[PDB]
């Protein structure tokens, strides 16, 4: 009747600084912290981070990005702090005017957008390389980078590629909290009803499937945590009744099952296919299809 959601008893010790497997220890920090508010739901150690080159690139570029957008927010607000904290959500570093096409915008808002985007480019790619390297230094696999690359694919398709194919940086997303929502709506409305973008439907299928799957996996692993199912790496190699019971639950339930490694394989795909299908479905919007409801009618999933 203990469901293992919140940890009852906390323990700790000298911080677990790390594992030296080819990591540069000098680029690592040495200060840790304990914060029990988390210990209740997870580890409490806000442990040492790695301060590297790619990380510095990312931090610098992305902070310039952030503060650039904040600068334009101020200018757009009359420098009145109360306007800033009033219209904070309604403000925007809107995207260049279509007149400029793909040329360097000849306005302030536009070039600020362009520069902030350059910074984001640098930051994201630096962080991807940082994932690759941190997994190469500890001697692990690069699955995390190839998953992130999926996210990068969508993000690029939206900021860089799709517009280049359409010939306008106007197509790209504004940097605001409500304006990028408005952008999504206007994108759907301009191009038919995006629902009828089969790849949109697939990305949705995989988002819902990711939630489905993580609830399944998590509830299972907490159910078999009384047999140490939380320790998975050791149930792939030294199988125990945790894995057997989980597999047999799902077998007796739906007729098929997985293994303590293959469920992880299933997760890595439902995740990345959310942004692989999205990128394609966004590329094809306006370059291959100016309206999706009619494509549906013609293709048979929508009625005449």
């Amino acid at each position: 009747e203990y469901q293992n959601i919140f940890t009852q008893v906390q323990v700790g010790g000298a911080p677990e600084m790390g594992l030296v497997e080819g990591v540069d220890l000098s680029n690592r920090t040495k200060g840790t912290t304990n914060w029990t508010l988390l210990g209740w739901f997870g580890n409490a150690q806000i442990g040492p981070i790695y301060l590297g080159g790619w990380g510095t690139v990312s931090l610098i570029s992305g902070v310039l990005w952030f503060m650039t957008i904040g600068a334009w927010f101020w200018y757009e607000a009359g420098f009145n702090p109360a306007v800033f904290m009033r219209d904070l959500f309604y403000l925007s570093l809107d995207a260049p005017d279509a007149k400029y096409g793909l040329g360097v915008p000849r306005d302030a808002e536009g070039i600020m957008w362009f520069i902030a985007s350059f910074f984001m480019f640098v930051a994201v790619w630096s962080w991807w390389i940082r994932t690759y390297t941190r997994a190469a230094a500890l001697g692990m696999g690069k699955h995390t980078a190839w998953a992130f690359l999926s996210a990068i694919w969508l993000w690029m398709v939206l900021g860089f590629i799709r517009p280049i194919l359409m010939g306008s940086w106007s197509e790209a997303v504004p940097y605001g909290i409500f304006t990028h929502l408005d952008w999504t709506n206007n994108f759907s409305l301009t191009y038919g009803n995006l629902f009828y973008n089969p790849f949109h439907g697939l990305s949705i299928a995989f988002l819902y499937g990711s939630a489905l799957l993580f609830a399944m996996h998590g509830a299972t692993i907490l159910a078999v945590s009384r047999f140490g199912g939380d320790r998975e790496l050791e149930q792939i190699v030294d199988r125990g009744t945790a894995a057997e019971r989980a597999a047999l639950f799902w077998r007796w339930t739906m007729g098929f099952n997985a293994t303590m490694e293959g469920i992880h394989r299933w997760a890595w795909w439902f995740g990345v296919l959310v942004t692989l299908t999205g990128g394609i479905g966004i590329l094809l919007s306006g370059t291959v299809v100016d309206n999706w409801y009619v494509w549906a009618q013609v293709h048979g999933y929508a009625p005449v």
Binding site: G53, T56, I60, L64, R106, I111, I115
Partner: protein, 52 residues
Amino acid sequence: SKFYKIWQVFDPRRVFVAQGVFLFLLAVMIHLILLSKPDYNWLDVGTAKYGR
């Protein structure tokens, strides 16, 4: 002067890469600033100069 003591408090690696990033990004930023201006845009300038 005793500026040469800074390398007793800073490590060459972090500082070098930070300075590289900072300078390159600054160059790009200022170049784009200029090209946004119908004036100082060397492309458009040399365009009008040679009458093309």
